[PDB]
């Protein structure tokens, strides 16, 4: 069934996040580039969470091709999918009016990531780092509407 | 087998309810959505129950799209499928004269939904609200006819 | 070894009775429905028995699909699986001269079906109920001819 | 393999005898029926034995159809395929000169088949029932030629 | 891989000898036989041994049909499996100059075969019973050349 | 996917390194030779590490052919994949601005390879030797930029 | 993969050596053979070792056909692959400049092969048999260049 | 646990009845048989079912021993073992006021035995045998006092 | 510790209630009567759930035996342990100031049993009847404090 | 449990007959060898079956020793151990009034032993020979006094 | 070894906290009650995590018995053990200069209990309340040193 | 039992060949030769077969020591082990009138040792050498009486 | 032997370092702590590796108690554990003239620890900090001899 989806340039991502699946999406993204350079694309999500290493693995590639990328959320969305959520163009990041989002987290390597990560997410919104930190270690489930003020999303339908 | 089913425009849902199967239905709903808009679909059920997180993971979708969705019950319809039953169009919610139907049922959020749920059926059914909580916390298996008076459904053959 | 069955439409029902198969049969019955309004089907049987839920689950379906149904028995005809047997049309029921057919058997519910069940099967012939509760609680293997007198069958080759 | 095996109207029966395989042959025997009613077919055997129930399940079915059935034996055939061997048309039961076909073999009905069964083999040739019960209770491996005097077999090669 | 193997009318017999494989060979031999008789066949072998009940399940078959059969050996030609080597036509049984061959080896009937069996293989060559039991009960590996004096072989490249 | 991407002259290498996968890459590398050998190709990477033996197995193969090979890194690159990274042509190899590498690790046979392996990597980057072995045994996760002055990689976007 | 691969006269041999693969390969030799006895075949190798029973199983075949055979090694090559390495025509046995080999490694029959084997390997190259024998239980891993003195091979690119 | 349990002449029988335990239950009886003919013994029950052949292994054993036996019941007296409830003396067979009890069930011997057993109550309980057969074929449970009117039980508590 | 436990005349019961464990319990009680049937006994709990049929295995023993019993609760008591919490000497049933407690739950038998319980607790508590079912059929956890004013418990600590 | 049995000079044999258990029983037999060869023993049985080779492992053993032996049967006497029923003396072989007993069963020796046994029982029963094989080859169950006519049993109870 | 510990009044608690283990502790605890009022058992810890519902079960017991208790920590103290650490006397709660203690975590009940914990530690620490509730949900491993000033620990070594 | 087996110098060896019986022996040979190397030690057998290299672990051990040894057989003197039958004092090797004893079977070693044993039994029996070569390579059973005439056995019973 | 190992104050530590084993070793130290604070103790090692977090669970304890400790090494002294080599008295650290010793290796805190150890050994050995650091971070397996002068050990044997 996943195949027949792909015939009009749509993807799904809901199970979990490892390295094995990570190789699939990148490959999926790469096939879709070499058939046309400009046919718009979307992305649908319903995630539990994930590791840290692949979060850049996808963001770098998404920032790489000829065409653009849109994003959509569904219900639950974790720390990782959140970063993926605010990754397409600014006014193509829709959601649903029942959805939750959260934010949450071989040594000297990683400390570059948690800082590099915040640099992105605190620059697409304008919100400064002081807002980020105390709201990044904790766990408080925002909603659809209040997230818009936070600067993750443009216009719920 | 299923390849021929979808050429007619029909879905099945009868095993149980997790995130895994929940990930599947959405895609099928999304498949036909891009094939045609003038293709009001049906939906059959034989459910034991389910979780809560996917409950408001479908009604979110079913409300949006250009087509409309009828739905039908068979045998035993549980808490979750019930919320799905009285969820499509006003006058396209049929059932059968042998059909058991009943109605019943991180921490800082789940307590919000079952007030959001009960905020639904009081509108669809017209019924008041406190009548729900004495009926929803209890267990009283109803049937075709006597469940009609609540206003879950609209017709039978 | 199923494709050329459904052309020259025929079904088989041979292993046992659970919810899993219960969802399969209904679909095949639904396959023929939207394929033709007239394709009088048959149904061959070899059962050990089953549960109570799927039993009336099917009999309702057989009547919603007014395109007519024929039924045939083989060897051993079990409990509720055999209740299907007389449930088809009155003059399109048949069996074989080597065959047995045996009849016997979440609380307030089930006590109704064993009344609703006998309510049906005693109306096909005109037998009382108390004649049934002598026969249904007990166990006595009958055969082709001696079971005809109870009034299950209409003819035989 | 079993496809082109079957496109020339031929079957195998080699492993053992359960209900699972029993449900399979009946279907094949029914496959060929609706393709042609006069394409008189054959059947090969290499059996260890089996249960009691399906023995009748096949013999009645052979008798139900219009076309004719030929049978052949190979090596071993215990007292469940042997019944099948002497069940096709009289002038079409062949065998081989290296073959051992010797035969030896809820409650209220099991005793009946062993009488109904002996009714056949004796009525097939004309042997009495004591000679039947004398050598049936026991086991003594007869062969190709000496089997012929019983009346099982007509030809050989 | 099989689809092209059986094309050109060639087979292989490579692992071991049970009842399961025994049904596979006969079926193949029959499948070829249902096409053109004049499609002269061959056969290749490499075996560790086998049982006896299937040893005289094939020579029966190989000897009836109109098409002639050629046989070739590889490596270790062990018991029974070797008995087929001499069982083809007299002027085609080739072999290889590296290949060994060993010819060693209910309780009223199995004893008959070891007499039936020796009678064949001695009549094939004209090598009396003295040579048989002297060499059959024992274990002595023979090569290409020295095997030829027994008359197993007829030629070689 | 694999048939779908490989038709576009692309490869992937994501999991880990054994002998079995080593046999697959060569096979892919050889399938793609004969089909238009003027097609320059690529190779994408995401590696945890691996053994030593295949490391040469690919590098020697890469030179045997007529076509040419470009290479790209993603995120994490291990010791061997790094050797692969500096395997292709000069200004036809790239990386990403969020990635890193790492370079560290039947007796005599192993020992020679550490030299020959080190031999190549020093005669590609205009670097001396003690610069290498000193940084080899240790472990220091470098970046995009500082790698470029280390003569591994260039021409990044 | 192997389908569109195997068209162009190529095989692989990567994992290890048992009896099961031994039968699989000979088939591949035979499929290309009767399909086209003109196709100049080739062969590639990578092995840890093997048994002895299958070494002669192939070399007898490799010569038996009409066409020719070329052989190539990569990296590692074991005792059995080595004998196979010197199986093709004198001027079509190449290798790679990073590769090695080794030459090393019921009763009455197995012993003959160790002597039969050495007789081959000397007459193909010319060296006396004792010097050949003398390093045939001594493990001492050789390279590309120093192998050429033995006459194992004839040319590297 | 039971090192002290057998001391005091006490038993428990709580799980089921198969071949394993039946042999074990025996060994408990006659370890005590040697010690005294006067030291009385008790016996407690809680069964969910029971076999048939093993049932006539114990009532046999329970007679022709020196010591005297008493019995006490609990909960759900399933079948067969129950027969054991009526196995001691007319005034040593107690029960409890929440205890229910039911009574239910080669060919030449099995059909013989469940008739022999009825003749055993041609000695004990509800005299009019023809009415012993009236009940055991039926499925309807009983209570303590509702069962006293037969004579299964003699001193309640 | 467990042999030391029973010598202290103390029990623990904290995992679950099935058929297996229930037989272990009944033994322990009477075993304390084995040494002395005049000795005050304790009984502690911490249960997550409970069965139903096994519940009417224990209540009688607690009333059958000679000695007196006291009961104490911990943490979470499901449906059944509450019945046991109110089962002992009146002024000998205690609890802790954290012990949440709740009370919750063939066809001709089961529906009879859960009327015997409603028939009871009004006698032990001293409360009405249909106010029992008014709360027994729902789910609402009652604390320690609000349980005292009910009547379940009478000396807290 | 069993070390106390052996200190009672008593055995049990109730499961089956294979290689494993027979090695145990001889040792149980032989434990008393080191003890006094006085102090006669007993032997109890309940077998569903039995092998043949192990049967002639025990019969001899009973005669080699000095002690005298008696035997007692229970329920069913499958075969081979059964024979052991008639192994002691003509006047120490008791039974019970429900104990059904039946009789039943390399080439060069397996034939030889079922002949050796038939040579025996006529010495123990006193009956002829060719009536033994006439009756042992069939299958038919005989009760106690049905065997007392023969001599298998000598003092019933 | 643990069987010897209880004699030298000491516990270890080092793996985890689930249902099974908790019942050991209570049992391990109260056995030592009567043996001395001034037992003042030690209690050692090294846990990686902790549950929530089982935690309260211990606190009541620890603050129930007549004996006193002292507690000592080792390294990694997860969420719950911290509560359990402070559970003791004001001056008998020691630690080590190497350790790291952290603080971390039915909706009508589960959410309700962490209220009760936050209600407590301000009594043991003397610190305020709502400063707990903001610093408890975050994650910052505090040392031995900086954890003294709160009041968790009362002496060091 | 198993020490009490060792008690009064007795062994059993009845399953198969394993590497662990010398361990069971050297206590005896050392503790008894310390006590008295002349007492009645014994050894019993019942084997289906054995290996060849393990056999030359024991025959030496039975002669390195001072004490004397006797040997007794049961039935299957399978192979190798048997050698052990004739491996004790020449007048202490008994047997039974029921036993089907038989005798049967790197490279530089294994071909040496089956010759070594052939060099022995002529010393223990008294027969020639090359008659052994022809009588062990074959396979024919010999009884007790047929074996005494050789010299394997010296006092029957 | 293991209780006897604990006797005369001896330990072994030879498999690995994980969570389970660390707790035993602690308890082993603690049982010995109670008997005397002065009876010295030994400690032996042979480790293949070692964790990090578990390592800072022991060094404290070995410094905590009153008794002294002396330590001895064997062969492969891996990472972490070894730290324990130099974790006793200044002059009771022996070794063997055959052994090879190595010294090797949340993010906010783990980075504290592998620096915290580097804080130590300049104190335990006496060598400056940076030297310790670089040597510790490479792989350089030192001997007994050359590892003495670093100061890890001060006597050999």
Short mmCIF file of N, CA and C in Angstrom, two decimals, chain A residues 4-5 8 12 14 44 96 100 141-142, chain B residues 23 27 30-31 34 53 56 60 64 109:
data_model
loop_
_atom_site.label_atom_id
_atom_site.label_comp_id
_atom_site.label_asym_id
_atom_site.label_seq_id
_atom_site.Cartn_x
_atom_site.Cartn_y
_atom_site.Cartn_z
N UNK A 4 1.58 2.54 -3.60
CA UNK A 4 0.59 3.26 -4.38
C UNK A 4 0.44 4.69 -3.90
N UNK A 5 0.74 4.92 -2.62
CA UNK A 5 0.83 6.29 -2.12
C UNK A 5 1.84 7.08 -2.92
N UNK A 8 1.95 9.71 -6.37
CA UNK A 8 1.71 11.15 -6.43
C UNK A 8 2.52 11.91 -5.38
N UNK A 12 4.74 8.66 4.34
CA UNK A 12 4.24 8.48 5.68
C UNK A 12 5.38 8.11 6.61
N UNK A 14 5.31 7.16 10.83
CA UNK A 14 4.60 7.09 12.09
C UNK A 14 5.10 6.13 13.14
N UNK A 44 3.58 13.60 5.97
CA UNK A 44 2.59 13.36 7.01
C UNK A 44 3.27 12.59 8.12
N UNK A 96 -3.57 20.03 12.82
CA UNK A 96 -4.95 19.64 13.06
C UNK A 96 -5.39 20.13 14.43
N UNK A 100 -1.14 17.32 19.74
CA UNK A 100 -0.18 17.66 20.77
C UNK A 100 1.22 17.68 20.18
N UNK A 141 2.76 19.64 27.50
CA UNK A 141 2.10 19.38 26.23
C UNK A 141 1.33 20.62 25.81
N UNK A 142 1.88 21.33 24.83
CA UNK A 142 1.15 22.39 24.18
C UNK A 142 0.04 21.81 23.32
N UNK B 23 -2.26 3.54 11.71
CA UNK B 23 -1.43 4.11 10.67
C UNK B 23 -1.89 3.67 9.29
N UNK B 27 -4.08 6.04 5.59
CA UNK B 27 -3.49 6.01 4.26
C UNK B 27 -4.53 5.61 3.23
N UNK B 30 -6.59 8.35 2.63
CA UNK B 30 -5.87 9.34 1.86
C UNK B 30 -5.69 8.89 0.42
N UNK B 31 -5.69 7.58 0.19
CA UNK B 31 -5.53 7.06 -1.16
C UNK B 31 -6.69 7.53 -2.01
N UNK B 34 -7.30 11.33 -3.12
CA UNK B 34 -6.64 11.94 -4.27
C UNK B 34 -7.11 11.31 -5.58
N UNK B 53 -6.04 7.24 21.96
CA UNK B 53 -5.24 8.20 21.22
C UNK B 53 -5.62 8.22 19.74
N UNK B 56 -9.57 10.19 18.52
CA UNK B 56 -9.53 11.49 17.87
C UNK B 56 -8.29 11.61 17.01
N UNK B 60 -10.93 13.63 13.25
CA UNK B 60 -10.23 14.80 12.74
C UNK B 60 -10.21 14.81 11.22
N UNK B 64 -12.92 16.60 7.49
CA UNK B 64 -12.31 17.58 6.60
C UNK B 64 -12.74 17.39 5.15
N UNK B 109 -3.17 15.01 30.30
CA UNK B 109 -3.75 15.30 29.00
C UNK B 109 -4.94 14.40 28.72
#
